[PDB]
UniProtKB/Swiss-Prot annotation:
Reported function: May negatively regulate the ATPase activity of VCP, an ATP-driven segregase that associates with different cofactors to control a wide variety of cellular processes. As a cofactor of VCP, it may play a role in the transport of CAV1 to lysosomes for degradation. It may also play a role in endoplasmic reticulum-associated degradation (ERAD) of misfolded proteins. Together with VCP and other cofactors, it may play a role in macroautophagy, regulating for instance the clearance of damaged lysosomes.
Protein name (record): UBX domain-containing protein 6
Tissue specificity: Enhanced expression in testis.
Cell compartment(s), UniProt: Cytoplasm; Cytoplasm, Cytosol; Membrane; Nucleus
Gene transcribed to yield this protein: UBXN6
Subunit structure: Interacts with VCP through the PUB domain (via C-terminus) and VIM motif (via N-terminus); the interaction is direct. Forms a ternary complex with CAV1 and VCP. Interacts with SYVN1. Interacts with HERPUD1. Interacts with VCPKMT. May interact with DERL1. Interacts with PLAA, VCP and YOD1; may form a complex involved in macroautophagy. Interacts with LMAN1.
């Protein structure tokens, strides 16, 4: 990344484990994120998987009730959007792996590496 004073994603991996002593929940975050990234990694042509709405049980009961696990997700290259619809006059947010990171798959690779290298 930019480096110096610890890169963002790396910095957020650190806060997650240090502030949240409950390793069950830390791992619950990791499981969910690694799983979401797996569908994108194993089938890179299926761009259709790179979509994660935040208003969902797995997110709300775990990642939303967790540490800077959310910051990690955005730091790996995801952006929040509010949907372009006319059914919902309120912001339904969606995490999407942004084109800025699509162009550099090696960065996503390092970001899943960083997360496992939580030693």
């Amino acid at each position: 990344g930019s480096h110096m004073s610890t890169d963002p994603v790396a910095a957020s991996i650190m806060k997650i484990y240090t502030f949240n002593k409950d390793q069950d929940r830390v791992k619950l975050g990791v499981d969910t994120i690694a799983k979401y990234l797996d569908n994108i990694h194993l089938h890179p042509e299926e761009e259709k998987y790179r979509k994660i709405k935040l208003q969902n049980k797995v997110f709300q009961e775990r990642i939303n009730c967790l540490e800077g696990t959310h910051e990690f997700f955005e730091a790996i290259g995801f952006q929040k959007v509010l949907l372009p619809a006319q059914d919902q006059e309120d912001p339904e947010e969606f995490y999407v792996l942004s084109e800025t990171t699509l162009a550099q798959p090696q960065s996503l690779e390092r970001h899943k590496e960083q997360l496992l290298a939580a030693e």
